[PDB]
Amino acid sequence: SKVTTVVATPGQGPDRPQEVSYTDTKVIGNGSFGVVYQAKLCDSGELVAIKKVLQDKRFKNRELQIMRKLDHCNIVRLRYFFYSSGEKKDEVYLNLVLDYVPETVYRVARHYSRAKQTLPVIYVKLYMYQLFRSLAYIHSFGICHRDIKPQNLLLDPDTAVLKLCDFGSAKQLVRGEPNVSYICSRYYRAPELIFGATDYTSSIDVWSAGCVLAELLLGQPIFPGDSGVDQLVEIIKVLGTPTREQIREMNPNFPQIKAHPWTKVFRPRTPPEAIALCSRLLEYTPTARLTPLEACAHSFFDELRDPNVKLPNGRDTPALFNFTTQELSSNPPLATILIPPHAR
Ligand SMILES: CC(C)Oc1cncc(-c2ccc3cnc(C(=O)NCC4CCOCC4)n3c2)c1
């Protein structure tokens, strides 16, 4: 019954520290960033995640400032943050107390591939829709995630709620200010980033999302490259060689191969609207890619807007159409498609 009590500021609302008590601490994740724990809150009994990262006193933490201003059903809420000691001697650690979610897209996708099965397309629709909705929301603040990958996409297996969680690579993209090119997980990295682009946009997340979509359809990563130029070689094998104009659009500042047909890339009987969506995300030209809100309105997701749609377990789908004023503001016309007649 070992209770840890800390003094923590709530993620939203006034800067008034309060006592937060928790127990049953266990490791659920780690990385170069640091460590993620699971814990149980003493009062409520609810499970939480505690992300612990190393922190400097003078410089302000970017992830924290990003996470505090996000409030969305497809993003893990920052419940509280607090400072502590850890593995090092004279070092302060930032702790982010977040919503807990019991599964990941990676784990579900791997569990299916271990059984030689493709994930049922209803789950592909549900998870990809919720990813794009979360991206639209964060992109409305000018925030780019910069690390969309199956490992970071959290899942409740019973409700099929998807949640974004890792904002350790995230950044407000200002037009004119340069950004690092070596970002995102390699297999999900936009080709402009491989070309060394420093003036890139939020469309890198859409490319990454497209790689996740393709992976869910294929049962394995679409572009499993080695480091350096070889990741671009993996992309070229499907997309064909990029033209001089496509390179200029990617990085304004060669091995010539024909594009493999999108139908031949995917399995027999992969839904044409899945393939169609994928071809409009995995585009060389970053401006040619769908926006996240355009992606949500794509016909691949029409089954989600059917009033008789259910999860495989027989439950109702999660909240997909409760779009706020803030969500709709980036492209208000799409509200017609996105909020279907029965949800109005
Ligand atoms: C590469 C991953 C570890 O990078 C990250 C980086 N930053 C934050 C996070 C993060 C945040 C909040 C949060 C809540 N649930 C989970 C979770 O992973 N649940 C999945 C389960 C998987 C099975 O074992 C129990 C945990 N969470 C992760 C992850």
Residue numbers in the entry: 35 to 287, 293 to 383
Q: What do the authors report?
A:
On these bases, starting from the INDZ core, compound physicochemical property evaluation and computer-aided methods were applied to support a scaffold hopping approach leading to the identification of novel imidazo[1,5-a]pyridine-1-carboxamide (IMID 1) and imidazo[1,5-a]pyridine-3-carboxamide (IMID 2) derivatives 7–18 as putative GSK-3β inhibitors with improved in vitro CNS permeability. Therefore, we conceived a new scaffold hopping design strategy to reduce the HBD count of the INDZ core (HBD = 2) and boost the BBB penetration of the current series. In particular, we replaced the indazole N-Ha with a C-Ha group and shuffled the ring nitrogen atoms resulting in the IMID 1 and IMID 2 cores. These modifications were intended to reduce the acidity of the Ha atom so to enhance permeability, while retaining the tridentate H-bond interaction with the hinge residues and enzymatic potency. Compared to the docked structure, a very good consensus was observed with core RMSD = 0.35 Å, thus validating our models. The experimental binding mode also confirmed the stable water-bridged contact of the isopropoxyl group with Asp200 detected in the MD simulation. Next, compounds 10 and 16 showed none or weak interaction with Lys85, while the isopropoxyl group confirmed the anticipated interaction with Asp200 via a water molecule. Based on the observed arrangements, we may ascribe the H-bond between IMID C-Ha and Asp133 carbonyl group to a weakened interaction compared to INDZ N-Ha, so substantiating the affinity decrease of IMID 1 and IMID 2 derivatives versus the GSK-3β enzyme.
In humans, GSK-3 enzyme is encoded by two independent genes that regulate the expression of two diverse isoforms, namely GSK-3α and GSK-3β, with high sequence homology (~98%) in their kinase domain and substantial functional overlap. GSK-3β is a significantly networked enzyme, which regulates a plethora of physiological functions in peripheral tissues and the central nervous system (CNS), spanning from metabolism and cell cycle regulation to brain development. Accordingly, balanced GSK-3β regulation and signaling is key to human physiology but often compromised in diverse disease conditions such as diabetes, cancers, and brain disorders.
